[PDB]
Amino acid sequence: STNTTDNIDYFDISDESNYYLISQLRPHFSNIYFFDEFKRYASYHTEIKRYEDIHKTKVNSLLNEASRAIGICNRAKNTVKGLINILENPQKFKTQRESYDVKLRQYEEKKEAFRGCLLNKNRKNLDQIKKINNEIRDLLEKLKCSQDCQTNVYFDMIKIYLVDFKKMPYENYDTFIKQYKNSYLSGVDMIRKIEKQIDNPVTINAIKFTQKEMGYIIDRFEYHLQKVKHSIDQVTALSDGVKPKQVTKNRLKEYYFNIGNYYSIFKFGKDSLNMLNKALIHKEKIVHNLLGELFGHLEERISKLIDSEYFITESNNIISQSEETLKLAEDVYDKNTKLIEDLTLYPHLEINEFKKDYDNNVEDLRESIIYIQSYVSSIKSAYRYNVLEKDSVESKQKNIPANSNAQKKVDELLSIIDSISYSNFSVAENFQKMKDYYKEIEKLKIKILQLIEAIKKYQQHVEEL
Amino acid sequence: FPFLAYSGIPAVSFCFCEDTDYPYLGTTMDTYKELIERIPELNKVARAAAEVAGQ
Amino acid sequence: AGSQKDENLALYVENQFREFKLSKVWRDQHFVKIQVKDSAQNSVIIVDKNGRLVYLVENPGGYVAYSKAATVTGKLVHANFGTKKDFEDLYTPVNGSIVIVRAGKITFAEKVANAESLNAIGVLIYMDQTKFPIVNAELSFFGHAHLGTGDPYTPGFPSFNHTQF
Numbered sequence: 289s290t291n292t293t294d295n296i297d298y299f300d301i302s303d304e305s306n307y308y309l310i311s312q313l314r315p316h317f318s319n320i321y322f323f324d325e326f327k328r329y330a331s332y333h334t335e336i337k338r339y340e341d342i343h344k345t346k347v348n349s350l351l352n353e354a355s356r357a358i359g360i361c362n363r364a365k366n367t368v369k370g371l372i373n374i375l376e377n378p379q380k381f382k383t384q385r386e387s388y389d390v391k392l393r394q395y396e397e398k399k400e401a402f403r404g405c406l407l408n409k410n411r412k413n414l415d416q417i418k419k420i421n422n423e424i425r426d427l428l429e430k431l432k433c434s435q436d437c438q439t440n441v442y443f444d445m446i447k448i449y450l451v452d453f454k455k456m457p458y459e460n461y462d463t464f465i466k467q468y469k470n471s472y473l474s475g476v477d478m479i480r481k482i483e484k485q486i487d488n489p490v491t492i493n494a495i496k497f498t499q500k501e502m503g504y505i506i507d508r509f510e511y512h513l514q515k516v517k518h519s520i521d522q523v524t525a526l527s528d529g530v531k532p533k534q535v536t537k538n539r540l541k542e543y544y545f546n547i548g549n550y551y552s553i554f555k556f557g558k559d560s561l562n563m564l565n566k567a568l569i570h571k572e573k574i575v576h577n578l579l580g581e582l583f584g585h586l587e588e589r590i591s592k593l594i595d596s597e598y599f600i601t602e603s604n605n606i607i608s609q610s611e612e613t614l615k616l617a618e619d620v621y622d623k624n625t626k627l628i629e630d631l632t633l634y635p636h637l638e639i640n641e642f643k644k645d646y647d648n649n650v651e652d653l654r655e656s657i658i659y660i661q662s663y664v665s666s667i668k669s670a671y672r673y674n675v676l677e678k679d680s681v682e683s684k685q686k687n688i689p690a691n692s693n694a695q696k697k698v699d700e701l702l703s704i705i706d707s708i709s710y711s712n713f714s715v716a717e718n719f720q721k722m723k724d725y726y727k728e729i730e731k732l733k734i735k736i737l738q739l740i741e742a743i744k745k746y747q748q749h750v751e752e753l
Numbered sequence: 754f755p756f757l758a759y760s761g762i763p764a765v766s767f768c769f770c771e772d773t774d775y776p777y778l779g780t781t782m783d784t785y786k787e788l789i790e791r792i793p794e795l796n797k798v799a800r801a802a803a804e805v806a807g808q
Numbered sequence: 809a810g811s812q813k814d815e816n817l818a819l820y821v822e823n824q825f826r827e828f829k830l831s832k833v834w835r836d837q838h839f840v841k842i843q844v845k846d847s848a849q850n851s852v853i854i855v856d857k858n859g860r861l862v863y864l865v866e867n868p869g870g871y872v873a874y875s876k877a878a879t880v881t882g883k884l885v886h887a888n889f890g891t892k893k894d895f896e897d898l899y900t901p902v903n904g905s906i907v908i909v910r911a912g913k914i915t916f917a918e919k920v921a922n923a924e925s926l927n928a929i930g931v932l933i934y935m936d937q938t939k940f941p942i943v944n945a946e947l948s949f950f951g952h953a954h955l956g957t958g959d960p961y962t963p964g965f966p967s968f969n970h971t972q973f
């Protein structure tokens with residue numbers, strides 16, 4: 289589906305003074321939008337025809353110089369596009385021989401190289417912009433009224449600007465960047481956890497680079513949205529207002545220059561927000577295309593961990609050996625029990641002194657066997673709690689929606705991997721306990737064999753009485 | 754309690770406590786998952802506690 | 809307390825307090841004495857009057873801090889909560905014996921302090937069905953038995969190196 293990025297013109301740079309912002313979109317300045325709005329301001333005022341003459345010359349010269357500089361750096365845009373379409377896909381990387389790190393370094397150098405070539409050609413047009421602004425100041429101070437002028441272009445064109453402000457959508461962009469940014473930071477939080485378990489570096493380096501680019505485009509979008517909201521608040525804030533009918537001539541000059549600047553910020557911000565919305569949706573689709581490759585390799589890690597952690601086969605080995613020991617000892621007592629029964633009839637008739645010891649041996653026999661049954665019941669009990677700890681994880685794995693759109697399945701698999709990690713402290717202590725008990729079964733096994741030996745020595749002694 | 758009794762500084766401690774106490778505090782089984790099966794949703798509750806202390 | 813991962817969480821919290829740009833961030837360290845488990849294992853184990861045969865109950869994972877390291881034998885008496893009124897209403901006298909209590913209603917140290925005041929020998933502490941409803945019965949837990957607070961081996965003065973211990 290989507291594996292590449294076609295548009296690059298969201299990249300930009302401002303000046304070192306941060307006063308003028310260049311865009312790679314048309315017409316690269318908000319001041320040109322100011323020049324068109326002051327052209328219609330000069331369509332009002334009959335006295336200033338020199339502005340529309342000059343304005344024709346300046347849109348010609350400025351647009352030609354701008355698109356010229358976009359040509360000279362269009363070749364550098366082709367190189368940077370080459371490194372981007374190397375870095376975004378794994379499939380373009382698997383044919384590539386150089387490792388990832390130096391390619392990332394080359395991406396950095398071509399990036400600031402691109403911004404540097406853009407600004408260094410646009411400086412000579414910035415000086416021309418300063419010339420135009422000074423010519424507009426002189427050309428506006430050509431006119432006549434230095435006492436009361438009127439301030440009908442202000443009181444009308446504000447209402448036209450408010451119609452234009454209610455035309456343009458704000459809340460969908462705001463809700464979009466809030467929900468989207470929440471999904472982005474949640475994404476980076478998923479990457480930091482997902483890096484430790486999955487073994488392949490190539491795909492996760494592609495995702496990490498992609499989220500870096502997403503971070504830059506998010507930062508630009510919050511910048512332009514901030515400029516739009518501030519310009520709307522300033523124009524409507526002047527429309528609240530005290531509404532003076534009378535201004536001085538210089539006050540009229542900074543007056544018109546002021547609101548023309550604000551509406552210029554609105555127009556430039558509109559087109560910038562439009563393009564950045566498209567770019568964020570595209571890169572978001574790239575990220576889902578990558579995680580779609582990732583989660584199939586993730587599930588194998590889960591299927592290894594569930595068998596690996598809960599010590600389940602070793603615990604079944606302990607239970608099998610313990611039940612085998614109980615069956616063995618109970619078999620031996622069932623073998624000797626009639627010989628016990630005769631050798632409880634021989635004591636009470638005669639000299640009881642050795643038979644006191646043998647009575648102690650019989651009590652130790654039956655009490656020992658009852659102890660072994662109690663130990664087996666204890667081990668089986670703790671094993672039951674352990675199996676329950678495993679089965680809750682299995683039910684949590686089976687209750688996932690397939691049916692995830694999008695990338696929430698990776699979040700669910702991280703949740704279940706987090707669950708297997710949480711069971712560790714209870715599982716380890718239960719298994720340690722099982723080891724302790726089986727040691728005590730061993731001790732009672734050596735003791736019970738010495739008991740049956742004591743029974744046989746007693747048996748030959750009673751034959752010797 | 755050492756801030757109140759020993760040093761004489763006023764002190765406050767508040768809990769969203771169930772009628773019976775929490776079943777496992779100093780415990781190996783106290784994890785996140787078992788907390789989130791005790792309490793179904795946690796973000797609004799800890800939000801309420803942070804609102805009280807911040808206020 | 810004092811483990812490596814605790815210092816990793818400490819440096820994490822400190823780097824967070826620097827990244828929030830607070831007005832001042834400072835740490836403080838001092839050396840205390842706590843009680844930890846030994847390599848040998850503590851156990852509770854049934855002894856018959858015959859003495860030939862000895863049955864083990866369990867080997868607890870959890871331990872009680874500031875308990876006295878010793879080994880004792882004796883007859884056991886149930887002592888429901890160790891409340892002083894509860895100790896007042898016993899049937900069998902308590903002395904020279906090992907009490908068992910249920911965890912609740914008071915700190916562990918007041919249980920051990922009260923049963924020490926009636927001259928018992930040892931305290932065993934558990935959790936029952938009714939007060940603590942849980943699925944697992946093999947669950948083990950942790951407590952401390954110091955009446956009053958603070959590091960006990962410096963009462964009243966702080967545990968720096970300026971006091972020279």
Ligand SMILES: *[C@@H]1O[C@H](CO)[C@@H](O)[C@H](O)[C@H]1NC(C)=O
Pocket residue numbers: 903904
């Ligand atoms: C303490 O208990 C023992 C029984 O173990 C008993 O012999 C003794 O008389 C008791 N102490 C007093 C002061 O009665």
Ligand SMILES: [Ca+2]
Pocket residue numbers: 958959962963964965966967
């Ligand atoms: Ca102290």
